Amino acid sequence: SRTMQTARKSTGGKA
Amino acid sequence: SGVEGAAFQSRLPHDRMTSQEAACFPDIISGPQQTQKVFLFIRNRTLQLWLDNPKIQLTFEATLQQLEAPYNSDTVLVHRVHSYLERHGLINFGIYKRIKPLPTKKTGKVIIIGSGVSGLAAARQLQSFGMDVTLLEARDRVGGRVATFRKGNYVADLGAMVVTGLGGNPMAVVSKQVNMELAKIKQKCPLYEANGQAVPKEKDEMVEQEFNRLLEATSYLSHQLDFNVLNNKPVSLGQALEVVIQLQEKHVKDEQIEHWKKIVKTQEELKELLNKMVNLKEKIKELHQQYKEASEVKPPRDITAEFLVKSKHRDLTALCKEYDELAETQGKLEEKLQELEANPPSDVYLSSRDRQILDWHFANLEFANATPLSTLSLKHWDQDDDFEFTGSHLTVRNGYSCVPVALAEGLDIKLNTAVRQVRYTASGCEVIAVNTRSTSQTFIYKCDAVLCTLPLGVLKQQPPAVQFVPPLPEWKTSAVQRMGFGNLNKVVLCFDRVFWDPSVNLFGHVGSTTASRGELFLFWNLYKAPILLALVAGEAAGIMENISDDVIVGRCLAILKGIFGSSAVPQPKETVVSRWRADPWARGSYSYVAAGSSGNDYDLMAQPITPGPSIPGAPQPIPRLFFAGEHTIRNYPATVHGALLSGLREAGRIADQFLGAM
Amino acid sequence: KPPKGMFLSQEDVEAVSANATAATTVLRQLDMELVSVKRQIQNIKQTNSALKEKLDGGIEPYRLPEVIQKCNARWTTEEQLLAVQAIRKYGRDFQAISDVIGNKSVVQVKNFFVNYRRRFNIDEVLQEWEAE
Numbered sequence: 165s166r167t168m169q170t171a172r173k174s175t176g177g178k179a
Numbered sequence: 180s181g182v183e184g185a186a187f188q189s190r191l192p193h194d195r196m197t198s199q200e201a202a203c204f205p206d207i208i209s210g211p212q213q214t215q216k217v218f219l220f221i222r223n224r225t226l227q228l229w230l231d232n233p234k235i236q237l238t239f240e241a242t243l244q245q246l247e248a249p250y251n252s253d254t255v256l257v258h259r260v261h262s263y264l265e266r267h268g269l270i271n272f273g274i275y276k277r278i279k280p281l282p283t284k285k286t287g288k289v290i291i292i293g294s295g296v297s298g299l300a301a302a303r304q305l306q307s308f309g310m311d312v313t314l315l316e317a318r319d320r321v322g323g324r325v326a327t328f329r330k331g332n333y334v335a336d337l338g339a340m341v342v343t344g345l346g347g348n349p350m351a352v353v354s355k356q357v358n359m360e361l362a363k364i365k366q367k368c369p370l371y372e373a374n375g376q377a378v379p380k381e382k383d384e385m386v387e388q389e390f391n392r393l394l395e396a397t398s399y400l401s402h403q404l405d406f407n408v409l410n411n412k413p414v415s416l417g418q419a420l421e422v423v424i425q426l427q428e429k430h431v432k433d434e435q436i437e438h439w440k441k442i443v444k445t446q447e448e449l450k451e452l453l454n455k456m457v458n459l460k461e462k463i464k465e466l467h468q469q470y471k472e473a474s475e476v477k478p479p480r481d482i483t484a485e486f487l488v489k490s491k492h493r494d495l496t497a498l499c500k501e502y503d504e505l506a507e508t509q510g511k512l513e514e515k516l517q518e519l520e521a522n523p524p525s526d527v528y529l530s531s532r533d534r535q536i537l538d539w540h541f542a543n544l545e546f547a548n549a550t551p552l553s554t555l556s557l558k559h560w561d562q563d564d565d566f567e568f569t570g571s572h573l574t575v576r577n578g579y580s581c582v583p584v585a586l587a588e589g590l591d592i593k594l595n596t597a598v599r600q601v602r603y604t605a606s607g608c609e610v611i612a613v614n615t616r617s618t619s620q621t622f623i624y625k626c627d628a629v630l631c632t633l634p635l636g637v638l639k640q641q642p643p644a645v646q647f648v649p650p651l652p653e654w655k656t657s658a659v660q661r662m663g664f665g666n667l668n669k670v671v672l673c674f675d676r677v678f679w680d681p682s683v684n685l686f687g688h689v690g691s692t693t694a695s696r697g698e699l700f701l702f703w704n705l706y707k708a709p710i711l712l713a714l715v716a717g718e719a720a721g722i723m724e725n726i727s728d729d730v731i732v733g734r735c736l737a738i739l740k741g742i743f744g745s746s747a748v749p750q751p752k753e754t755v756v757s758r759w760r761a762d763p764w765a766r767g768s769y770s771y772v773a774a775g776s777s778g779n780d781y782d783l784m785a786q787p788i789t790p791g792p793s794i795p796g797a798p799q800p801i802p803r804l805f806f807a808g809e810h811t812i813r814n815y816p817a818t819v820h821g822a823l824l825s826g827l828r829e830a831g832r833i834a835d836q837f838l839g840a841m
Numbered sequence: 842k843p844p845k846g847m848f849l850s851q852e853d854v855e856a857v858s859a860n861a862t863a864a865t866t867v868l869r870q871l872d873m874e875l876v877s878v879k880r881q882i883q884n885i886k887q888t889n890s891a892l893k894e895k896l897d898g899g900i901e902p903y904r905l906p907e908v909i910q911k912c913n914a915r916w917t918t919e920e921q922l923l924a925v926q927a928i929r930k931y932g933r934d935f936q937a938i939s940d941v942i943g944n945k946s947v948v949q950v951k952n953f954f955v956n957y958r959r960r961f962n963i964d965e966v967l968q969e970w971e972a973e
């Protein structure tokens with residue numbers, strides 16, 4: 165899931 | 180902040196009691212506020228004691244000595260709290276020197292299917308509680324989806340690779356117990372386009388911001404507008420992004436139309452003015468000739484002839500006044516026209532290049548969830564965001580296999596043993612397995628309980644690899660069906676020299692098409708030896724498993740040649756390509772929240788099965804078939820720490836059932 | 842509360858999602874509307890270009906020099922007779938009558954209406970102006 169992202173962590177829709 | 184930080188590191192609120200604690204301490208939580216703070220301090224302090232030195236067992240006696248008054252006053256309360264923490268695996272988990280040797284007499288018998296991190300973690304706990312434990316593993320090694328490649332001095336991970344922050348992570352404890360060479364991964368990640376040249380800094384930041392705005396919009400679409408069903412089918416994240424992108428393209432065209440509609444309105448107003456000025460100019464021209472004829476009547480003349488000259492003079496200056504006022508209005512509208520022709524709105528929402536770079540960010544999302552965005556649930560894909568750990572992500576430079584190998588120490592593990600059938604009844608269970616090397620050699624293991632850590636991919640198989648007798652209930656199998664099990668692969672490239680930037684841990688490659696956006700889209704430089712590791716994500720993952728290693732390695736070299744130059748990139752000494760979907764003991768990489776599923780399905784996967792009674796009218800039997808693994812933990816799915824935590828959870832639930840609580 | 846510069850009304854979402862090809866239809870309708878307006882600009886741009894050709898030169902051949910007259914209180918017979926004709930043509934537009942005569946202010950023209958009312962039958966002259 166989103167937590168797996170190391171490079172260019174997506175921010176859109178996260179608190 | 181001392182005890183408060185111990186709570187945080189154990190994923191607990193320092194200032195209140197959890198649901199799990201309320202169940203074991205109903206007297207405390209329903210009682211007065213002062214006694215709750217004593218409980219909370221004892222809990223937080225015991226955790227701190229364990230976390231400060233996790234290499235040795237924290238006993239109840241050692242805990243009570245290091246508490247001070249008035250907290251060490253009540254000794255049964257300290258004993259109840261310590262026992263709770265030990266049973267649920269918040270203290271004395273992983274690999275530690277035991278103070279009190281294990282009791283020779285073992286109580287109860289458990290078979291654990293699979294020796295991945297979830298199975299191994301549960302096994303250690305159950306053995307530590309004094310149960311007889313045997314693990315059945317189909318592979319010739321422990322670790323499962325923790326799979327480390329090792330040849331010479333090359334050490335690369337084909338499965339789990341990264342510790343995703345130590346803040347709150349139980350792998351922080353394991354890293355003090357086992358020598359994992361944890362190395363921080365630096366965030367800097369330059370993208371290189373299809374041609375091989377870097378994306379300019381101005382464009383790179385523009386697309387990334389738009390990507391996140393698009394994501395934010397899908398969340399807005401989901402929660403505020405309730406856009407979660409479409410044609411009696413659940414809306415995916417992919418659909419939602421498509422809909423959002425289309426609405427931006429619509430707005431670009433609506434913006435152009437309104438701008439060009441403003442120009443025609445100005446041009447029509449000018450047209451109406453110019454016609455009025457042409458008609459007026461003609462009236463002035465005629466009136467000038469009439470004045471000139473009247474003026475050429477030479478004096479002396481009567482007063483009517485004099486009046487005619489002066490009458491026409493007045494009338495001509497009055498019309499020349501009107502034409503001058505209209506020429507000012509002509510000048511106002513001509514410059515007002517030129518400002519709108521100078522400042523148009525945008526031609527396109529996103530160009531070909533922008534859209535390509537945007538697909539990379541989508542591919543990075545398809546890597547994260549190990550699946551195409553068309554499969555992800557819009558509402559619930561990111562349901563575990565709140566439990567993200569703090570801190571830098573870290574490489575395991577020793578190879579992540581060092582963890583399961585260490586966890587396997589002193590455990591009865593039957594390798595090359597493929598479970599074929601699980602039988603569970605009110606009187607007990609039997610697991611039927613075979614030797615993977617010669618399938619005729621059959622084995623029967625009889626036990627009080629079974630812990631199934633089979634991957635969701637294996638549980639999904641149709642026709643099934645493992646048969647359950649009796650069959651699993653509809654509520655379990657529907658959850659298995661609903662849940663997503665993704666795919667993600669890795670290409671390891673081992674060279675004789677470093678031809679890349681050693682201070683940059685990762686760099687992207689933007690694909691030519693949307694279809695191939697996941698194909699070799701991200702490279703990793705994490706290890707001491709010269710190794711590059713490329714990811715195949717998204718729709719490419721499944722398709723690229725049907726292509727040979729030589730071709731895949733060729734495509735990596737093609738990309739790397741484009742970025743660093745043909746002379747700089749040699750042929751690699753060793754190469755490896757993972758094929759996780761074709762792996763019969765995985766059948767994919769890890770779980771995702773598919774459209775139609777939710778976080779609640781992870782809780783359903785975790786719920787144990789209770790068989791029917793053998794004799795009719797016999798009392799309700801106890802649960803026999805339990806489940807662990809990354810697909811069973813709602814708050815930490817698709818991770819090593821999730822698997823770890825799920826094993827600790829089930830060891831506690833099994834121990835509570837067969838050894839009794841406390 | 843959408844993100845800034847994203848446009849996500851309830852109506853827009855339904856229009857683009859109502860069927861499989863509704864998205865591409867909506868965008869094509871606006872593409873055709875855009876081409877339609879662009880040619881309408883070209884039409885009027887070329888119409889206005891032709892009208893500017895007809896206004897070429899301005900009104901510079903037809904403009905007369907600025908007459909700069911000193912105002913005077915004494916009415917000559919000539920000026921009285923100019924006024925009776927100016928009243929016959931222009932009626933009560935006192936500014937017009939002043940410009941014709943050349944050396945009388947707007948107030949002096951108004952005094953003329955009262956002072957010479959009976960002598961120049963100004964009521965009859967205004968009745969003849971109203972009849973046309």
Ligand SMILES: Cc1cc2nc3c(=O)[nH]c(=O)nc-3n(C[C@H](O)[C@H](O)[C@H](O)COP(=O)(O)OP(=O)(O)OC[C@H]3O[C@@H](n4cnc5c(N)ncnc54)[C@H](O)[C@@H]3O)c2cc1C
Nearest residue numbers: 293295297317323324338339340341598768808809818819
């Ligand atoms: C490419 C990839 C990259 C990853 N990267 C990361 C990362 O960076 N960080 C992270 O936290 N996590 C990562 N993960 C996830 C992590 O590997 C898993 O979540 C975790 O290891 C799963 O542990 P498990 O015990 O739940 O399942 P598994 O590790 O799969 O263990 C289950 C065991 O059951 C065995 N088995 C299957 N069928 C049978 C049978 N019939 N009989 C007996 N045994 C059987 C299997 O061989 C296996 O050993 C990654 C996974 C993949 C695929």
